[PDB]
Design a protein around this ligand. Structure first.
Ligand SMILES: [Zn+2]
Ligand SMILES: [Zn+2]
Ligand SMILES: [Zn+2]
Lengths: 410, 406, 415
């Protein structure tokens, strides 16, 4: 487990630099708050878990060392309910806890494998591992309070689209599904108790933002899906109203987006989804003060990362880079693996013409993207602009030392 | 009598706490009054106790009223180049009170509230009072001696007034009078001048921690302080550590303060910031142990609040209460102690004690009706006939007498 | 050859030391330690290599050596050494490990990164020798120790002073882990020492001043210059007593009480205006209170300014703090070339080139500091910047690019 936490970091750093990862706070927070909810109900967990979202309209999901589960945004277009989406995550979670890929290789090497995981994200197991991944998957899926029949329903809807479409989805290549696999999935969900679970409000909002803001190819949020959601339950109707407000924002129709979002923010002034969108609309119309005052009146400002990055950007476009830096210095210290915070920090330090601090912030973004040589180059320039023996020299040079360890390792 | 004016003074002070942006920082208020106090004792015509308040306002102004209550705007620190210049403002303002000028002026002619609304308008950054040419011709020349017996620069006043002229606010409430200030300062004596170590750090924390508008701690000043005497160089290092903490640069803050704390482990200013850095990194245990080994722990109010706060964050609300229960009876008018004591009593689930501590906070801020409401709630949760019920109801009685006077 | 291979490894390990271990780079302490160490080498047998002596800022007592005649000594040796001959006995011990090639023999018979990672762990706040290795080192050491004019009994007196501390103390001195000390070794050290004639030698005045500066200026943990020691030295021999006033002036200056350090320094300055030790202290007192010019005038009038690296570095720095960066550059461009390994010169050269706004020269001076510390990739980065700010084909471009090539060929030899 010692090495595979480390090879996980090397592989996800490569994923950041090459694959089109969705770095959105609201979506990343959702996929990881949901995914961690199942890990807490999973057995034999050796590692922390992180869940990544790729902008890819091809449906696929996979996982590797260090509890890193990779999910394509296409999973939101296929998932009718939240339990189906978590059904695939528990499928992936069980692949890690059982260490399936670990043993496939215990029976030159790491770069040949890394090209495989990377090519899958950018636009296979034998069925003995896949039966077991279903085995443990639904127990976890049911002790997580989800619908156990969501897996046979979701597996079956992959099969219905593999005959009624030319070539099958890519998920069925890494996770093949014969009729035996379905019949087992269909039986064991039959064997446990019926559950009536409503999909969380965050699932429908996350689907809308995924298909609305990160549209690409078959990943569209179409009028047919929004009109259908206008008839659905109370949670789907707010998400369709949010989806219309989102797309009115995307199309630069800011005043309509404000009036469309108004009934949802008036009903829930402290919801982070509506606060995020209301900041985009205000910033789109050069009213940063309104976007600043609204987020300072948010209850969860100092506890919610989405609100912290949102108000930092609002401070940035509002001409107060120092206020942005105060948030972003604390944000990057508590969320050191978040590339959004380091980037906004680099923008803030650049606005203050703190050149060494700007280069130091840029370096973290490059290190997160697997560009360690270039991160070292920026920190070397930073170190060369400050007196030797200064605290900034020692800091920049020590950071260079730590990144050289990661490069000497591979 | 002095009695009505001391009570009128308390009423105006309560109104200031509720609406004006006061700086309640322990280190700054301890310094502001410690310097005032031994400055007070060098005047003999004083009828009243004296308290000195600091207001977060970038517009320079200073004023005083009944009960020896003086108000100093934080903008005073950027205008004051040395300790004597800062005390020159205070010596001028305390001399107004000791000779009873403002009381004299209102004996000539709804009134008490009209003056209080004016006092807030001057204090609040968001109508004014004005003195006659004699009145402050009294105050300055009566105040230059009060400054000299306290061992500060007599020439510190004049250089401050000329630094006011070329910029044409203090000038509405306050050449003839100025020419007399330089007229009168040159005659007395020339004086060796050395700011206290606390003045330089106090100016650093005011401009660095309470920066607002024109009240910034600029990169020009601390580069200059690094070239001064060894007091200003330690202050410059303290200000840079302070701004690093303000910018949440926690590691840089610890390494900047480390040489100062190693040289002066018992210094209250550095011990204070070391707690802020430790709590900012969720290291409450380390901050507690450091404060227990401080020499002046059970004698210095700043250190007691710092350790009490660290006990709260450290998950020890009882130990925090043991400190704060004694602190609030030694510093009845300190809202910080009452607020921290309310946080501790909330964490111990002593509800009636929490309502009682919250009530004192509202009483100090002038919201007597609300304080009476919270004590009424506390008294309803405690058994009739208990000592607690007798205290809560007695405190309500005391607060009702206060509001019946005005 | 094998001398060449071992001096190539020696340089690699010295660079690693400079990059991670806390070496004292003080001009006076470095000069003294190497002048005393060379004095022993000149009386040693079978010397094949130059020798360099390094001082770690570590209050744990330890001493060891590796390829290329590089001897590294923890500053805690000054706390244990009552007299110069005691300190010399430990160095003679280490030089004898080098002349016997004990470390070379072990690795030859039966990894470069494994040995270098141990050397850094021993210096930062393990290698062990057999009892024959220690037996060879003590005899050969004590013979070179007295041919150098020191007290032979200092070696057993220091060993027994080490054995006594190990028995009572919770943990043994770390030097006794690298150099194990059974009673058999101490009895053998007493035998050969007793075999020669008694020799009561006065420690050099340079020794007492070095111990004062080592413990007073580079104090750390148990490495303090206590008031007990100096009150004790105020009563001593002719050389010890002025070393007392020197250390007293040091911490008066360390505590930023410069006026106190003036009055303490006055009589030794007035009595001895031509020795580097108080001249050095008589520059730091002056610059600390912004009196740079007479610190320059005092050093400009020094006799051995064109002979002694300490006065040159002191005067170069005074020119910098005095607002005359070019005068500092004139000295340091020549000092860096004659003292290629002194990282103080490269740093001061960079500070002067920075003040003159000669950015590529500054980056180039910084790079030599980084190369000396084993950070070759970083030194190459700075030279690449320097090469990018001068025109291609120029004299400076060809120099910076040739220097990059040298650092790259130095890098591949071990990577
Ligand atoms: Zn699978
Ligand atoms: Zn006045
Ligand atoms: Zn040995």
């Amino acid at each position: 487990i010692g090495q595979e936490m480390q090879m996980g970091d090397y592989y996800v750093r490569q994923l950041r630099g090459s694959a089109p990862l969705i770095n959105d706070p609201l979506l990343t927070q959702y996929i990881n708050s949901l995914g961690m909810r199942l890990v807490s109900h999973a057995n034999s967990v050796k590692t922390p878990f992180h869940f990544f979202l790729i902008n890819n309209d091809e449906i696929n999901a996979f996982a590797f060392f260090g509890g890193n589960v990779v999910l394509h945004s296409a999973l939101f277009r296929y998932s009718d309910n939240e339990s189906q989406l978590a059904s695939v995550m528990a499928h992936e979670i069980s692949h890690v806890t059982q260490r399936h890929l670990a043993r496939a290789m215990e029976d030159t090497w790491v770069g040949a494998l890394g090209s495989i995981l990377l090519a899958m994200a950018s636009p296979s197991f034998t069925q003995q591992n896949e039966q077991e991944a279903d085995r443990i998957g639904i127990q976890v899926l049911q002790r997580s309070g989800f619908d156990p029949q969501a897996m046979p329903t979701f597996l079956e809807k992959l099969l219905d689209q593999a005959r009624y479409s030319s070539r099958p989805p890519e998920i069925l290549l890494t996770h093949p599904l014969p009729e035996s696999r379905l019949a087992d999935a269909r039986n064991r969900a039959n064997q446990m108790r019926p559950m009536v679970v409503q999909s969380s409000e965050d699932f429908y909002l996350a689907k809308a933002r995924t298909l609305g803001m990160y549209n690409s190819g078959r990943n569209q949020l179409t009028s047919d899906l929004l009109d259908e959601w206008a008839k659905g339950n109370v949670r789907q109707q707010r998400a369709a109203q949010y989806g219309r407000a989102l797309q009115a924002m995307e199309a630069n129709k800011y005043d309509e987006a404000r009036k469309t979002l108004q009934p949802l923010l008036a009903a829930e002034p402290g919801n982070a989804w509506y606060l995020d969108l209301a900041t985009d609309i205000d910033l789109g119309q050069n009213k940063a003060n309104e976007a600043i005052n609204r987020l300072k009146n948010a209850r969860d400002l100092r506890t919610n990362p989405v609100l912290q990055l949102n108000l930092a950007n609002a401070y940035l476009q509002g001409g107060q880079p120092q206020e942005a830096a105060n948030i972003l210095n604390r944000y990057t210290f508590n969320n050191k693996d978040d590339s959004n915070g380091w980037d906004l920090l680099a923008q803030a330090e650049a606005a203050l013409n703190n050149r060494d601090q700007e280069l130091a912030a840029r370096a973290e973004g490059y290190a997160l993207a697997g560009r360690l040589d270039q991160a070292i180059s920026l920190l070397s320039s930073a170190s060369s602009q400050v007196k030797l023996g200064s605290l900034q020299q020692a800091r920049y040079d020590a950071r260079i030392d730590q990144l050289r360890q990661l490069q000497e390792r591979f």
